[PDB]
Amino acid sequence: MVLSEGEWQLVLHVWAKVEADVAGHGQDIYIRLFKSHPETLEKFDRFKHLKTEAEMKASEDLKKQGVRVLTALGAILKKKGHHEAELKPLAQSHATKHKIPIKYLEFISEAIIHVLHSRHPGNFGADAQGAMNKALELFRKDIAAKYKELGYQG
């Protein structure tokens, strides 16, 4: 499954705007994920007690987590599909330490697309959203193959 260089440029041009303030984008993506699919918050032992969007917004630890997640995903997207080294540690921790099913990776993908669609209409028109969806589908397909190698059905 393979993206064209033009699709990768549409992915990297919206990611450049995310990088103006990766912490703010991470907060919005995690609030969207937890609001839309509340069951995903139960996987975070440090954050599952948060009850409202205001508590989520005020959590310094959740802000730091959002920066970690988006910076790891950004490094994966900048490899333009050559991300085997980056996916190894991530697949292992998400399969075995955190136990994150592929369905929850689909939910965070949905949250990312929703937040980029809302914040970045200048760089997230239909063709760019289609390229980001392809990049995230590639990421989830390769993560799912690694999960199977690691012994996790998820």
Beta carbon of residue 46, minimum distance to ligand HEM (angstroms, whole number): 4
Out of 11, 50, 90, 131, the only residue in the binding site for ligand HEM (CB under 6 A) is 90
DSSP 151: T
DSSP 41: G
Draw the binding track, 29-58, toward ligand HEM (x: CB under 6 A; -: no contact).
-----------x--xx-x------------
CA dist., res. 37 & res. 12, Å (int): 27
Should residue 73 be labelled a site residue for ligand HEM when binding is judged by CB under 6 A? yes
Q: Which stretch binds ligand HEM (CB under 6 A): 15-23, 65-73, 120-128, 146-154?
A: 65-73
Tell me the angle at which helices 5-18 and 126-150 cross, rounded to the nearest 10 degrees: 90
Should residue 148 be labelled a site residue for ligand HEM when binding is judged by CB under 6 A? no
Q: Is 21 left (phi over 0), alpha (psi -120 to 50) or beta?
A: beta
Question: In angstroms, how far apart are the furthest CA atoms of the chain?
Answer: 43
Residues contacting residue 64 through CB under 8 Å, at least 6 positions apart: none
Beta carbon of residue 40, minimum distance to ligand HEM (angstroms, whole number): 4
Draw the binding track, 91-110, toward ligand HEM (x: CB under 6 A; -: no contact).
--xx---x-x---xx--x--
Q: Of 40 and 123, which has the nearer Cβ to ligand HEM?
A: 40
Beta carbon of residue 138, minimum distance to ligand HEM (angstroms, whole number): 12
Can you read off the two tokens belonging to residue 23? Answer: 């912490």
Report whether 120 contacts 147 (CB < 8 A): no
Contact footprint for ligand HEM (CB under 6 A): 40, 43-44, 46, 65, 68-69, 72-73, 90, 93-94, 98, 100, 104-105, 108
